Design an enzyme around this catalytic site. Sequence first.
Site, PDB file in Angstrom:
ATOM      1  N   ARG A  58       0.824  -1.219   0.000  1.00 30.52           N
ATOM      2  CA  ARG A  58       0.000   0.000   0.000  1.00 30.52           C
ATOM      3  C   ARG A  58       0.860   1.274   0.000  1.00 30.52           C
ATOM      4  O   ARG A  58       0.485   2.270  -0.611  1.00 30.52           O
ATOM      5  CB  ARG A  58      -0.996   0.011   1.180  1.00 30.52           C
ATOM      6  CG  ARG A  58      -2.053  -1.092   1.127  1.00 30.52           C
ATOM      7  CD  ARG A  58      -3.401  -0.674   1.711  1.00 30.52           C
ATOM      8  NE  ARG A  58      -3.331  -0.249   3.115  1.00 30.52           N
ATOM      9  CZ  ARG A  58      -3.234  -1.066   4.169  1.00 30.52           C
ATOM     10  NH1 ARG A  58      -3.184  -2.393   4.017  1.00 30.52           N
ATOM     11  NH2 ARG A  58      -3.186  -0.551   5.397  1.00 30.52           N
ATOM     12  N   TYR A  67     -12.765  10.181  -0.516  1.00 29.62           N
ATOM     13  CA  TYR A  67     -14.047  10.053   0.200  1.00 29.62           C
ATOM     14  C   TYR A  67     -13.938  10.426   1.685  1.00 29.62           C
ATOM     15  O   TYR A  67     -12.871  10.323   2.303  1.00 29.62           O
ATOM     16  CB  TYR A  67     -14.690   8.681   0.001  1.00 29.62           C
ATOM     17  CG  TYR A  67     -14.073   7.551   0.777  1.00 29.62           C
ATOM     18  CD1 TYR A  67     -12.947   6.888   0.301  1.00 29.62           C
ATOM     19  CD2 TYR A  67     -14.623   7.127   1.990  1.00 29.62           C
ATOM     20  CE1 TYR A  67     -12.383   5.836   1.014  1.00 29.62           C
ATOM     21  CE2 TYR A  67     -14.060   6.083   2.708  1.00 29.62           C
ATOM     22  CZ  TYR A  67     -12.936   5.445   2.218  1.00 29.62           C
ATOM     23  OH  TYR A  67     -12.357   4.387   2.902  1.00 29.62           O
ATOM     24  N   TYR A  77       0.646   4.443  -2.448  1.00 25.70           N
ATOM     25  CA  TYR A  77       0.467   5.822  -1.951  1.00 25.70           C
ATOM     26  C   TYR A  77       1.540   6.789  -2.487  1.00 25.70           C
ATOM     27  O   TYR A  77       1.234   7.956  -2.770  1.00 25.70           O
ATOM     28  CB  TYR A  77       0.405   5.892  -0.411  1.00 25.70           C
ATOM     29  CG  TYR A  77      -0.662   5.013   0.253  1.00 25.70           C
ATOM     30  CD1 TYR A  77      -1.875   4.710  -0.383  1.00 25.70           C
ATOM     31  CD2 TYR A  77      -0.448   4.487   1.531  1.00 25.70           C
ATOM     32  CE1 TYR A  77      -2.826   3.896   0.231  1.00 25.70           C
ATOM     33  CE2 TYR A  77      -1.397   3.681   2.148  1.00 25.70           C
ATOM     34  CZ  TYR A  77      -2.582   3.393   1.500  1.00 25.70           C
ATOM     35  OH  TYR A  77      -3.522   2.588   2.124  1.00 25.70           O
TER      36      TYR A  77
HETATM   37  N1  LIG Z   1     -19.624   3.826   5.510  1.00 28.96           N
HETATM   38  C1  LIG Z   1     -18.796   3.739   6.586  1.00 28.96           C
HETATM   39  N2  LIG Z   1     -19.271   3.518   7.837  1.00 28.96           N
HETATM   40  C2  LIG Z   1     -18.446   3.427   8.919  1.00 28.96           C
HETATM   41  N3  LIG Z   1     -17.107   3.544   8.832  1.00 28.96           N
HETATM   42  C3  LIG Z   1     -16.508   3.775   7.632  1.00 28.96           C
HETATM   43  C4  LIG Z   1     -17.334   3.891   6.418  1.00 28.96           C
HETATM   44  N4  LIG Z   1     -16.490   4.113   5.387  1.00 28.96           N
HETATM   45  C5  LIG Z   1     -15.233   4.130   5.899  1.00 28.96           C
HETATM   46  N5  LIG Z   1     -15.246   3.932   7.239  1.00 28.96           N
HETATM   47  C6  LIG Z   1     -14.066   3.874   8.152  1.00 28.96           C
HETATM   48  O1  LIG Z   1     -12.887   4.407   7.534  1.00 28.96           O
HETATM   49  C7  LIG Z   1     -11.886   3.394   7.343  1.00 28.96           C
HETATM   50  C8  LIG Z   1     -11.120   3.686   6.046  1.00 28.96           C
HETATM   51  S1  LIG Z   1      -9.963   5.024   6.222  1.00 28.96           S
HETATM   52  C9  LIG Z   1     -10.690   6.404   5.345  1.00 28.96           C
HETATM   53  C10 LIG Z   1     -11.622   7.262   6.219  1.00 28.96           C
HETATM   54  C11 LIG Z   1     -12.264   8.466   5.500  1.00 28.96           C
HETATM   55  N6  LIG Z   1     -11.232   9.412   4.969  1.00 28.96           N
HETATM   56  C12 LIG Z   1     -13.162   9.218   6.452  1.00 28.96           C
HETATM   57  O2  LIG Z   1     -13.146  10.450   6.479  1.00 28.96           O
HETATM   58  O3  LIG Z   1     -13.931   8.638   7.234  1.00 28.96           O
HETATM   59  C13 LIG Z   1     -12.688   2.096   7.404  1.00 28.96           C
HETATM   60  O4  LIG Z   1     -11.943   0.912   7.733  1.00 28.96           O
HETATM   61  C14 LIG Z   1     -13.733   2.419   8.458  1.00 28.96           C
HETATM   62  O5  LIG Z   1     -13.204   2.286   9.796  1.00 28.96           O
END
Ligand SMILES: Nc1ncnc2c1ncn2[C@@H]1O[C@H](CSCC[C@H](N)C(=O)O)[C@@H](O)[C@H]1O
EC number: 2.1.1.-
Lengths: 397, 397
Positions: free
Chosen positions: A67, A93, A71
């Site tokens: 990873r 996202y 990156y």
């Molecule tokens: N729909 C969702 N519901 C709950 N947790 C989520 C999610 N999508 C991402 N995550 C969390 O984010 C982690 C990826 S890391 C990226 C996080 C993203 N930048 C943010 O702002 O939230 C996942 O393993 C999980 O813990």
Amino acid sequence: QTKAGSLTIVGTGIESIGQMTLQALSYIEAAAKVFYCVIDPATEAFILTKNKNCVDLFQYYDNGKSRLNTYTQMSELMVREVRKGLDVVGVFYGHPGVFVNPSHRALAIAKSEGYRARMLPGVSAEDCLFADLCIDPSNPGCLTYEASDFLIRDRPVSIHSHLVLFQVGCVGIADFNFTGFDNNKFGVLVDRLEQEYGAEHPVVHYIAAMMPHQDPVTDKYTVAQLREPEIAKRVGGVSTFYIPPKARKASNLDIIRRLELLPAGQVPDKKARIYPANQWEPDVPEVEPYRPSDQAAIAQLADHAPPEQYQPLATSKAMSDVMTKLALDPKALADYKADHRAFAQSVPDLTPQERAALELGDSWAIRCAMKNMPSSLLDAARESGQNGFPWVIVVGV
Amino acid sequence: QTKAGSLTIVGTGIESIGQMTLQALSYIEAAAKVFYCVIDPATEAFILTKNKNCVDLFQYYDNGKSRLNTYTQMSELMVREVRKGLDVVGVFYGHPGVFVNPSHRALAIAKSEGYRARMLPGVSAEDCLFADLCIDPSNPGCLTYEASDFLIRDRPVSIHSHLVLFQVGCVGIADFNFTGFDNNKFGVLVDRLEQEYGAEHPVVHYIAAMMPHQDPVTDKYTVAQLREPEIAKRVGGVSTFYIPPKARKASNLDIIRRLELLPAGQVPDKKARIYPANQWEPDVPEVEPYRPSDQAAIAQLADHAPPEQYQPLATSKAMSDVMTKLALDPKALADYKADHRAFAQSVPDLTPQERAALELGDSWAIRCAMKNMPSSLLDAARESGQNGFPWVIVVGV
Ligand SMILES: Nc1ncnc2c1ncn2[C@@H]1O[C@H](CSCC[C@H](N)C(=O)O)[C@@H](O)[C@H]1O
Ligand SMILES: Nc1ncnc2c1ncn2[C@@H]1O[C@H](CSCC[C@H](N)C(=O)O)[C@@H](O)[C@H]1O
Ligand SMILES: O=C(O)CN(CCN(CC(=O)O)CC(=O)O)CC(=O)O
Ligand SMILES: [Mg+2]
Ligand SMILES: [Mg+2]
Ligand SMILES: [Mg+2]
Ligand SMILES: [Mg+2]
């Protein structure tokens, strides 16, 4: 003075399309080149309607590829276009700096080489968690960790505060597979939670809805239930855990004295709680929403009038229109920042005061031009010695 | 079945207008009645252009009036209109459930009486802090407290993680004054920070920009410098403190073994850091952005092709348009949720697969209709036993 090229990194939020900010959208539309990393296809399709020159960063993952190498590549694709003199936008996202490596790397490189560089905040999965589980991080504090880091560095828990754990579906995994991660070290996380909280303490499995019509997953289990194969299998790549407090923490007598929260008597009990109580906390008693004090406050609404020191909005269509344009048109903002006076002169229908406020650009001048300040306030307020005029606090402890 | 009346609480973000989400805007426009609590007048003026029936909740504060009585009144004004059968929207600056009392109260009352009730997340002051100070809560964890609660309950600090403190400008204050709070117990907070971190440790005074052209305040001081009257006076109602870690935490040998992060050898040192390093942390050494491993990864970009298991977007204008409408039109969403099949039948130009996916409404069906899934992926993927298809993790520890 200012060399060509810039990098702006923005977020999309979690729920498809709707959780993008107005400014994130405006910068995506204005960009020369867009690079993106999102989960849902409706958000992807939306972005492609807004700019003609987009690249999906997800194509730089591969089976068994580290990873970190992915990156490094993601960050270099963005910075290469900045070096060519282009206005570049990267899109991740949620919030683009919350549990994200390549955004921080690309921004730091761009800044060190002398280009314009900025991150715009977005709505994170933790922001969604507070909204869907009906909790406030202020009551009674919040600790947030990455699940593997939590274990490897033996990070402390507080049994009296909220605990949030991200990435509970990939405990101990450094690489990638398109079919998903084999989460066979999940039991190591469960052992740690048993040690800290006990086998019967609640854990909430949280997944925020990614499409507008779907409901979130908000499933409570005991720590012990997480060992069952049928329950453990439900935890995946977008799963987060919330663990509520075990107990209420008492007040410190020395601090009560020094802050003078005493009538030579006593404050409320540590479990004399403000409505509403946290519904996930074990053995929480029911709290009365309409106490005698609540009823008396509601009775005062009938004869209420705005206080004498309240500041009513008093602006114009021309002023509201220009302040909206500065927030929603990146080209207009750049033009204003380059020459306040020239920009302000060119706006039609502004009043003399409005025009003078824009020429200066100072926060207090603009506020003064848009709100009526009563004489009663200014006689007591002490303006010079704004810094000391925005006071809107919406919670008490 | 479903009684008339609903409450939706939304946020505006921190920076004027631009940090509002697309869905927050759409619900404000659709509402029968709007109640709001914001700091800046440009955001206030913007809201009033979007709905004809708005009420400013700030008029319910008064000099010497308990904030709890104000919050009871704010919540009751909203719930009264819900009981009349209206679709009501409440609006708070930032995230409407982060350090906010009356939102949680009004939503809990509405839900208990059988009305539709929801909070939509927004961008908080902490979200802005991560973006402007260039830090990630994941590295190396984050603790967040209210400053008075921090002191009164003697909440623990972790010297190895981030610390964020809200409401540092009103230590120990239960009431309100229009001219601002007299922060004469600020020295009690400084004593606690000296005990935990030492007199020469950094503290960052953070104020996010509220207007689009202004820069944030990001001023570093020592704990000792906060005792100086000229510096202490700068801390006000929109001030937040960030305190960086003092040291790096080492890895646990038992966990390294059980997670199998070993080649019968050793992992990196606790200070072998991933670029970029936290610039606020004291005595942090400079980290190389382009190591030999970084250079080799960049060299592989020339011959890169998308992997065989990558899933390209493959949708239509008609499908993208309907998914966008469901995210941006609350009336269309309600119609869809009431009758999936009737709604799906009425959308023109959809393909048979697209139409069938909307009839079902299942996440995996919609994703399947909008993305091409290669045969190589499906032969290895294991679909039935989506839940196990969204895997996009963008950070490593
Ligand atoms: N729909 C969702 N519901 C709950 N947790 C989520 C999610 N999508 C991402 N995550 C969390 O984010 C982690 C990826 S890391 C990226 C996080 C993203 N930048 C943010 O702002 O939230 C996942 O393993 C999980 O813990
Ligand atoms: N412009 C700004 N910059 C930094 N912190 C801010 C801010 N505006 C508000 N805050 C923080 O928020 C506290 C008020 S409580 C309300 C917080 C708001 N709901 C949010 O989502 O952030 C302030 O005392 C301060 O600690
Ligand atoms: O060892 C420390 O310094 C951390 N804790 C020590 C106690 N920890 C241990 C634990 O997490 O269980 C918290 C506690 O249990 O009191 C005190 C502190 O905040 O400095
Ligand atoms: Mg956004
Ligand atoms: Mg403990
Ligand atoms: Mg919003
Ligand atoms: Mg310590």
